[PDB]
Amino acid sequence: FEGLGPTVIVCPTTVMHQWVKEFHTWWPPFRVAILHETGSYTHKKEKLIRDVAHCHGILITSYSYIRLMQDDISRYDWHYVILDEGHKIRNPNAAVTLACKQFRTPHRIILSGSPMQNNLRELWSLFDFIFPGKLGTLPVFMEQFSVPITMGGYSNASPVQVKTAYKCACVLRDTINPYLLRRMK
Amino acid sequence: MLGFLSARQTGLEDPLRLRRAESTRRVLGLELNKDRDVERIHGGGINTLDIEPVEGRYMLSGGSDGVIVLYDLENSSRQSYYTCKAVCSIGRDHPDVHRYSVETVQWYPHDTGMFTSSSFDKTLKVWDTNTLQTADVFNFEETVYSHHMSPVSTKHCLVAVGTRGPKVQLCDLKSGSCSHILQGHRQEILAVSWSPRYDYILATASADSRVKLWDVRRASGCLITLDQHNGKKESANTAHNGKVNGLCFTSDGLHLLTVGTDNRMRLWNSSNGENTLVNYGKVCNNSKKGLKFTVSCGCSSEFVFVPYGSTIAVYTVYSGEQITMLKGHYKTVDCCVFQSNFQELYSGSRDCNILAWVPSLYEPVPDNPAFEDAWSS
Amino acid sequence: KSRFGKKRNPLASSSLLAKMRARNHL
Amino acid sequence: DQKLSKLVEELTTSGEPRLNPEKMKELKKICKSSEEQLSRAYRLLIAQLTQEHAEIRLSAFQIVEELFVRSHQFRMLVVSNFQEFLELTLGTDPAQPLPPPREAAQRLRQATTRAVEGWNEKFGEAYKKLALGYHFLRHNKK
Amino acid sequence: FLKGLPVYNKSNFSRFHPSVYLPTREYPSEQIIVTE
Amino acid sequence: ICEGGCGRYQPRIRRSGLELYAEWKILLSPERVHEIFKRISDEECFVLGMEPRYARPEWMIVTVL
Amino acid sequence: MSYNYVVTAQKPTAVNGCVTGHFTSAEDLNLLIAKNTRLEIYVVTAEGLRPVKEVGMYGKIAVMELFRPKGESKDLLFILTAKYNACILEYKQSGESIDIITRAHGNVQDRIGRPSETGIIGIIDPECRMIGLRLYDGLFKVIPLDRDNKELKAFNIRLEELHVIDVKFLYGCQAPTICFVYQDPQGRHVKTYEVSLREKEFNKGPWKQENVEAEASMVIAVPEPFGGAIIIGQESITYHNGDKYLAIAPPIIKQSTIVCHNRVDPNGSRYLLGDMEGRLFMLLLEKEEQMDGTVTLKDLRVELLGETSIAECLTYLDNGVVFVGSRLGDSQLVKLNVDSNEQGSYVVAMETFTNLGPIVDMCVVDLERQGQGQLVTCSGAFKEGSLRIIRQKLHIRTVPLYESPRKICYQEVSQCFGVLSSRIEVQDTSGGTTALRPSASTQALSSSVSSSKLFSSFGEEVEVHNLLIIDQHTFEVLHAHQFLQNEYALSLVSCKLGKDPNTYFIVGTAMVYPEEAEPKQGRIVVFQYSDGKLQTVAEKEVKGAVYSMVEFNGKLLASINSTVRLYEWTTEKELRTECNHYNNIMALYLKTKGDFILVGDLMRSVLLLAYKPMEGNFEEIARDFNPNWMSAVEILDDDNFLGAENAFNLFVCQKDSAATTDEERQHLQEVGLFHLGEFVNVFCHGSLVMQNLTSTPTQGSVLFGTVNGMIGLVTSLSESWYNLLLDMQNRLNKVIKSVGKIEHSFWRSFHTERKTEPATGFIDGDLIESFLDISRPKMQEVVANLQYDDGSGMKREATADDLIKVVEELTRIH
Amino acid sequence: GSARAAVSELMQLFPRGLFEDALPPIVLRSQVYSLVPDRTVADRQLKELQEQGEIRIVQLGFDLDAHGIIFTEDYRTRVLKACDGRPYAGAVQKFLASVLPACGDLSFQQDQMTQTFGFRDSEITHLVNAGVLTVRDAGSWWLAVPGAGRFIKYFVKGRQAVLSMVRKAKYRELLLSELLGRRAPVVVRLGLTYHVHDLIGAQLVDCISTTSGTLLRLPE
Ligand SMILES: [Zn+2]
Structure with missing residues (x-):
């Protein structure tokens, strides 16, 4: 492709209006279309999607819409998938997670100020989206990373177990650094 | 010979011409241990060999019984026909010995203080050469068939290991990693080999008759799945017609060499992946394990030494002609390595001896009592 | 009297190998 | 070339503990005259060996034993394919067994070994594949 | 014909019958050739 | 052998439990046998004791429960 | 460990490339002469070539091309070095100071890739939007010449054809096009590709591939009125333009092979061609004007123009004067005349620029017995082969032999030199062979033919070797001794063997046959020069080639293939074998100091053999196991061993100063490394200056001559004197910057296609000797906090006046 | 040695009348x-x-x-005279006018055939009906030549036969001039000359030259 191709952004419905404003106050040339029941065409939605794909513009979609049409959006060769509040795909077995992961674009970005909230399964789901290979399949990740670190956090493990938790955390901390920019206030 | 010398001091021919010409002449004159012998410590068959990247002096070896023996390959003695002694051996008495057969060993590029050996005991071990102990142990779910380290990359220390499982494993010496894994294959991965030209380019050969060119940085599948007949282009595009159990990049990395159990050998363009249609004749290959082979470097026309039953075959890499067969072994040969500086060959086979193939045509001048016919008159 | 190492052809298996022992001796 | 073919058949089908000398004399007289023909005779020998009827194999080995010691060219060809001769004579191949007669097969193997020690004692150093082969039989397969 | 060879100045070579440059002033190169 | 066909050595098809085998020991997939039966001519199936109108060999594999 | 010193007593004289263009100013035309590491810029004036500047780059000039980007006045210069350093230089004229500023610079070399067989090929686009580079097989570097960017991105394009012979940029194409000749097992073919920056790959060319002859070696692009390329081979000269192809097969080009070409007329009408036999040709393209307004080609014609030096590069300057640059012989300026000179030659040599060609061997000799040694070099290759006498002012005297001299040795008792000649002879139909030209062998005062009863491919070119005896004063061949048929003279020494007091010309030789590579038969014939005759006294038929011979304490020492054996003279005038040594591949070179022997092998590095008289056998004291192809060896002191590389490097070996075990002392240690950038052919002990006793810290002197003609000095240095010059060397780089912005540490770093290390144990004499010719204000930057060590050295610091003093005696060594 | 010339000679050898002008004349890459x-x-x-x-x-x-060669023009001319008059004659003609002159790949993928050539999922059986589309796998299928069954059956039978007699030959050699001179065995009908070329390519024998012509031997 020449330049920036068609880009899809998935954000919570309370965030779409803010996103469309920022594009209009930081780069006017970008054409931004929002997929919603209200919409802006008062007609069939497929049309808008097709138009966006054609003009190589920017399409903003609610999370529930990606679940509803998983076989329609993914076939139009999108160039970038940006997820605002990306922790919405934190559960690997959730249908929203399955729909989000169907994009074939190598470039996929998650915007989540709290990536992990509950466990390393939460982290693996997000990292399986941006980089499927980096952390392996969940059974290997569950056994080799999460179990040794969640067992060493208790203040009752044998001194070998705590050192295992440190080593597993150290290996996990530096296999995600280039793919996680985490800056606190 | 003399004309090459005279043309060098006169300046008609660039000095590289004589060196390449004399290098390729030595390869053609390869013959058995005219001035050498390898000390025998492997009770079982020898599976792998590797010459150190720098100074090409010490050679590792891995037997079918699990012992790994480090060798010495220069004449510290005045007399000829020296024996290649072993500086050290990691045998049964070692606490960290490969319990089962060790499949392939490799020197770490850029220094000789560390080397990695992977066995069928589902482990890749990092070793300290000086102290002969381990530093990192990488256990795997399935058996390990091969492992390669990038000989030219300086920004990373990733070691690529292909297991019996259908998915490549990328371990990083830096940190532990052991979690990066490449998907796209269907069966046992018998050969992995990095590209000497591009740091992050990896070639993986597996039993599904597919060889895939990967980029480790790439987060979306493979780059090229090499096909045989160059159709328009996966679950298709078979690289060979059986089980691809070999992989050897050329000297410059511009072309790929693959050997399968279809008794066929193919040469593939590294960038686009189209096969160059070099036929090579019939290359006998029934091995169900990783078949290790090498390609000559620093000669007029590059050669490839591939194991061929109980012999080693020499082919021109691009011309694809059979130069000669080095009939020295008694059992099937599975690994061959090339000494770039001296144009020598070392062959590991299953008769428990490493054979050295040294260039001939240099003999002592007398002033042979055994070389006569005894026919009656 | 060292037998291996040295004779540089990045990390010369001494900075890198200490990291392996700095994380596996745990 | 026709004559050498007839002699080879006669020695193999003689069916005696020792091959007839006259015929062996003729083979020898034919072998030296031409080196190419000697190579052809070598070729014939291996072919006769790879068939059947260990007694014929045993008779063939008597021919092979004579042409080794008195001909360096033949001495090279045996070394060049010493692996095949090792399976054909000693029956060391895991797949192919020694064909009948069983007593003749015993004689072929027993007579074959006694050569090898002398084979190695007189020509072991010069011919490196031969030295490896004798060590391979003695130490690997015992 | 063969002759008629080109000329650039008739005076050139018409009356036919060392120093090593060590730079001192430095001007930065406006371009640099790079290899991928 | 296949001998108008393709003349390839037909495998000796043997059965174990609910798994079908084929040697010459490639496991015989239900998808594989569905493919094979999908390309049988009507005349061949009729000669094969089958009524193409009512009983065609592909339908003897379970694709919809 | 070893403190050495490498200086140049004679700058290289063999040109590698000449380009004519407007580089100095837009009006006058320049002739830019590229010797090995030097760049002579001339200006064509009324009184001949008038020099303007000589500049020495920090590299071996591989390609130089003059190109003019649109919108810029003069012709900028593109220079590439053997270490793959690229630089675009423009001559800036500012009053009196003249500066060759570097417009663009950088190193273009891949981390892996075999250098090509033919060599580095550098071509500029005719309309100058790209710089095509052929550096390695299968690749093709492109450097787009666009002014807009702040940096030019050099990128590779893959070549489907691995063995490319010569590639040139075609003319008159709307898009860039390369026309190259490549070799496959099928044969040699010409194929044109179209290269695009916006795509970064190749496209199909204007015309489909043809088939050219099996020895085609040159591609000549033709300018706009014609277009297309001219392919030159050994037999035929072809033209391709897309639809028209016609080739000539002139019988004159049968004898030799065209190796250099130049354009006379800007419209491509005339081309000058030179061969290996010094002949000069003119290639003419016949015009064909059509009614449509386009001119086409009619036929091709080439004719003899005369004989010049053996040209490797020639250019047309002006007014019918052509420069003839010669690696083998002497560069010339020749005038093309309208008429002949009653000899059939249209050229006349106006002047000759001296050039010590391939210095195959040298001998240092002190005639008239002073402390000044005078150097006699075996220079020249085929026709300009001459003995050169180097005598301060570096005088040079030429003795044209008109053949190839191989080895030289001085015999003081006979007051004569001995040189080994070799002349090229074309076999005739009478069963023998005839000389092509009169030579020193055929123009000798007396002649003899070797007659040895050791033993009893027609129509080819046969080489016959001779031994010449040269008078010390008159320098005329008193005696030519032609050797046997198909016999090559390899080594020659003058020595007195045994207790017999007569001095002999003992020469080793090998017999060469076309049916096999490494010779298996040879002779060790002893000669004596008495009363104007060269009688034969002994003869020893060795089985091999006698590559090198030395005298070992009254016993002859010779190398035969892979065997270095010793021959002792007997009372009955015979040679016998005493001690042999077989652990070698090819003992090409041998030296000796005392009872020690240094052996240089073709593959392995130097080896220090020893001779213990008590047991009468050889002993391998130590061996350098590093793989290094050898060109010359020398024993500096009893512990320092000097050797020359195949890849233009010098190394110094030492006998394992810390020798503790038996395996440690076996290993010779390479303690000094240096990239001379030139192929050393001979090492000789001696000096060219007044030999001084008192306090001369530059201990020793070893002259070496190279292929391109440099004569240099290698001298051991003291511990303290190595140090203060080294940091003086280090600080001298920060003041006098190079021309292509090449780091001096990079240019002098040891380089081989499998190993690259920084230089050590070597001080570049040329760099520190350049401390003299800097202005005083910039000298202070060199000497800021310098500590001078003398004797005990109680921290006396240093000043500018101190450092000019010390370097001065470092200028009087050579 | 030209491949254009090489393929032509084999074509001449083919027993054209043996197969009743139905199978186009196959020549092997071996x-x-x-x-x-x-x-x-x-x-x-x-x-x-x-x-x-x-x-x-x-x-x-x-x-x-196993890679066979069929002449294009003859491949064209023979499918119509075989397809016509049959139910499958419909879209095989389309396959011919569309697929053959636009592609040369040995096997067609599912998405390729259905999209590039616009093939439905019902008429695809008709090409499978009479030797037009083989079965490589679920996703791909090699190009077929109609009526190839009989050829390979005789071809394989012949190869085995020639191999057998070569082995049987006394001293396990048999002169090439002794094949042509001797009557061809009735077991193989494709032609004795046809098969001896096949083992040469398959390297089951080596063309060893001698004073008495050229000789073939089993590999050692
Ligand atoms: Zn079938």
Whole structure:
């Protein structure tokens, strides 16, 4: 492709209006279309999607819409998938997670100020989206990373177990650094 | 010979011409241990060999019984026909010995203080050469068939290991990693080999008759799945017609060499992946394990030494002609390595001896009592 | 009297190998 | 070339503990005259060996034993394919067994070994594949 | 014909019958050739 | 052998439990046998004791429960 | 460990490339002469070539091309070095100071890739939007010449054809096009590709591939009125333009092979061609004007123009004067005349620029017995082969032999030199062979033919070797001794063997046959020069080639293939074998100091053999196991061993100063490394200056001559004197910057296609000797906090006046 | 040695009348290597000469390296005279007018055939009806040659037969001049000359030259 191709952004419905404003106050040339029941065409939605794909513009979609049409959006060769509040795909077995992961674009970005909230399964789901290979399949990740670190956090493990938790955390901390920019206030 | 010398001091021919010409002449004159012998410590068959990247002096070896023996390959003695002694051996008495057969060993590029050996005991071990102990142990779910380290990359220390499982494993010496894994294959991965030209380019050969060119940085599948007949282009595009159990990049990395159990050998363009249609004749290959082979470097026309039953075959890499067969072994040969500086060959086979193939045509001048016919008159 | 190492052809298996022992001796 | 073919058949089908000398004399007289023909005779020998009827194999080995010691060219060809001769004579191949007669097969193997020690004692150093082969039989397969 | 060879100045070579440059002033190169 | 066909050595098809085998020991997939039966001519199936109108060999594999 | 010193007593004289263009100013035309590491810029004036500047780059000039980007006045210069350093230089004229500023610079070399067989090929686009580079097989570097960017991105394009012979940029194409000749097992073919920056790959060319002859070696692009390329081979000269192809097969080009070409007329009408036999040709393209307004080609014609030096590069300057640059012989300026000179030659040599060609061997000799040694070099290759006498002012005297001299040795008792000649002879139909030209062998005062009863491919070119005896004063061949048929003279020494007091010309030789590579038969014939005759006294038929011979304490020492054996003279005038040594591949070179022997092998590095008289056998004291192809060896002191590389490097070996075990002392240690950038052919002990006793810290002197003609000095240095010059060397780089912005540490770093290390144990004499010719204000930057060590050295610091003093005696060594 | 020439000779040898002018004359890539010594180039010439549209190389199943060659024009002329008058004659003609002159790949993918050639999922059986589309796998299928069954059955039978007698031969050698001179065995009907070329390409024998012509031997 020449330049920036068609880009899809998935954000919570309370965030779409803010996103469309920022594009209009930081780069006017970008054409931004929002997929919603209200919409802006008062007609069939497929049309808008097709138009966006054609003009190589920017399409903003609610999370529930990606679940509803998983076989329609993914076939139009999108160039970038940006997820605002990306922790919405934190559960690997959730249908929203399955729909989000169907994009074939190598470039996929998650915007989540709290990536992990509950466990390393939460982290693996997000990292399986941006980089499927980096952390392996969940059974290997569950056994080799999460179990040794969640067992060493208790203040009752044998001194070998705590050192295992440190080593597993150290290996996990530096296999995600280039793919996680985490800056606190 | 003399004309090459005279043309060098006169300046008609660039000095590289004589060196390449004399290098390729030595390869053609390869013959058995005219001035050498390898000390025998492997009770079982020898599976792998590797010459150190720098100074090409010490050679590792891995037997079918699990012992790994480090060798010495220069004449510290005045007399000829020296024996290649072993500086050290990691045998049964070692606490960290490969319990089962060790499949392939490799020197770490850029220094000789560390080397990695992977066995069928589902482990890749990092070793300290000086102290002969381990530093990192990488256990795997399935058996390990091969492992390669990038000989030219300086920004990373990733070691690529292909297991019996259908998915490549990328371990990083830096940190532990052991979690990066490449998907796209269907069966046992018998050969992995990095590209000497591009740091992050990896070639993986597996039993599904597919060889895939990967980029480790790439987060979306493979780059090229090499096909045989160059159709328009996966679950298709078979690289060979059986089980691809070999992989050897050329000297410059511009072309790929693959050997399968279809008794066929193919040469593939590294960038686009189209096969160059070099036929090579019939290359006998029934091995169900990783078949290790090498390609000559620093000669007029590059050669490839591939194991061929109980012999080693020499082919021109691009011309694809059979130069000669080095009939020295008694059992099937599975690994061959090339000494770039001296144009020598070392062959590991299953008769428990490493054979050295040294260039001939240099003999002592007398002033042979055994070389006569005894026919009656 | 060292037998291996040295004779540089990045990390010369001494900075890198200490990291392996700095994380596996745990 | 026709004559050498007839002699080879006669020695193999003689069916005696020792091959007839006259015929062996003729083979020898034919072998030296031409080196190419000697190579052809070598070729014939291996072919006769790879068939059947260990007694014929045993008779063939008597021919092979004579042409080794008195001909360096033949001495090279045996070394060049010493692996095949090792399976054909000693029956060391895991797949192919020694064909009948069983007593003749015993004689072929027993007579074959006694050569090898002398084979190695007189020509072991010069011919490196031969030295490896004798060590391979003695130490690997015992 | 063969002759008629080109000329650039008739005076050139018409009356036919060392120093090593060590730079001192430095001007930065406006371009640099790079290899991928 | 296949001998108008393709003349390839037909495998000796043997059965174990609910798994079908084929040697010459490639496991015989239900998808594989569905493919094979999908390309049988009507005349061949009729000669094969089958009524193409009512009983065609592909339908003897379970694709919809 | 070893403190050495490498200086140049004679700058290289063999040109590698000449380009004519407007580089100095837009009006006058320049002739830019590229010797090995030097760049002579001339200006064509009324009184001949008038020099303007000589500049020495920090590299071996591989390609130089003059190109003019649109919108810029003069012709900028593109220079590439053997270490793959690229630089675009423009001559800036500012009053009196003249500066060759570097417009663009950088190193273009891949981390892996075999250098090509033919060599580095550098071509500029005719309309100058790209710089095509052929550096390695299968690749093709492109450097787009666009002014807009702040940096030019050099990128590779893959070549489907691995063995490319010569590639040139075609003319008159709307898009860039390369026309190259490549070799496959099928044969040699010409194929044109179209290269695009916006795509970064190749496209199909204007015309489909043809088939050219099996020895085609040159591609000549033709300018706009014609277009297309001219392919030159050994037999035929072809033209391709897309639809028209016609080739000539002139019988004159049968004898030799065209190796250099130049354009006379800007419209491509005339081309000058030179061969290996010094002949000069003119290639003419016949015009064909059509009614449509386009001119086409009619036929091709080439004719003899005369004989010049053996040209490797020639250019047309002006007014019918052509420069003839010669690696083998002497560069010339020749005038093309309208008429002949009653000899059939249209050229006349106006002047000759001296050039010590391939210095195959040298001998240092002190005639008239002073402390000044005078150097006699075996220079020249085929026709300009001459003995050169180097005598301060570096005088040079030429003795044209008109053949190839191989080895030289001085015999003081006979007051004569001995040189080994070799002349090229074309076999005739009478069963023998005839000389092509009169030579020193055929123009000798007396002649003899070797007659040895050791033993009893027609129509080819046969080489016959001779031994010449040269008078010390008159320098005329008193005696030519032609050797046997198909016999090559390899080594020659003058020595007195045994207790017999007569001095002999003992020469080793090998017999060469076309049916096999490494010779298996040879002779060790002893000669004596008495009363104007060269009688034969002994003869020893060795089985091999006698590559090198030395005298070992009254016993002859010779190398035969892979065997270095010793021959002792007997009372009955015979040679016998005493001690042999077989652990070698090819003992090409041998030296000796005392009872020690240094052996240089073709593959392995130097080896220090020893001779213990008590047991009468050889002993391998130590061996350098590093793989290094050898060109010359020398024993500096009893512990320092000097050797020359195949890849233009010098190394110094030492006998394992810390020798503790038996395996440690076996290993010779390479303690000094240096990239001379030139192929050393001979090492000789001696000096060219007044030999001084008192306090001369530059201990020793070893002259070496190279292929391109440099004569240099290698001298051991003291511990303290190595140090203060080294940091003086280090600080001298920060003041006098190079021309292509090449780091001096990079240019002098040891380089081989499998190993690259920084230089050590070597001080570049040329760099520190350049401390003299800097202005005083910039000298202070060199000497800021310098500590001078003398004797005990109680921290006396240093000043500018101190450092000019010390370097001065470092200028009087050579 | 030209591949254009090489393929032509084999074509002449073919027993055209033996198959009642139904199977187009197959020649093998194995016997191509017999006439041309340098195989390395034989594939290269046939490769461009494949996309040149004057040859069809069909993959067969008697071994892994089974690649047959059918003349394009003859491949065309024979399918119509075989397809016409049958239910499958419909879209096979389309396959001919669309697929053959636009592609030269040995096997067609599912998405390829359905999309590029606009093929439905119902008429695809008709091509499978009479030797037009073989079955490589679920996703791909090699190009077929109708009526190839009988050929390979006789071909494999013949190869085994010739191999057997060669082995049986006394001292395990049999002069090539002794094949042509001797009457061809009735077991193999494709032609004794046809098969001897096949083993040469398959390297089951080596063309050893001697004073008495050239000789073939089993590999050692
Ligand atoms: Zn079938």
